[PDB]
Amino acid sequence: MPHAFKPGDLVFAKMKGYPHWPARIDDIADGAVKPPPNKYPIFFFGTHETAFLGPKDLFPYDKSKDKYGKPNKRKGFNEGLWEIQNNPHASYS
Fold this sequence. Notes:
By secondary structure, this protein is α+β, with helices and mostly antiparallel strands.
């Protein structure tokens, strides 16, 4: 049975106007800006951008990859697919 989201979990994350995007739940570094309540820091593969999202926009990657894990014209998307499959836990800073 599922647990709550934790840092390191792999997802597709949904933002308005964008396709479901390969991403991970990030940690928050000591001294770094914390997300709003009930939101998680999402790191988007390929673009390497961070946004704050709640669980309604987070789809576990294993369950969802068949549907959302296909190449997309959008900037950074195919690089992101490579990252989440090949080195999802690396530093991309």
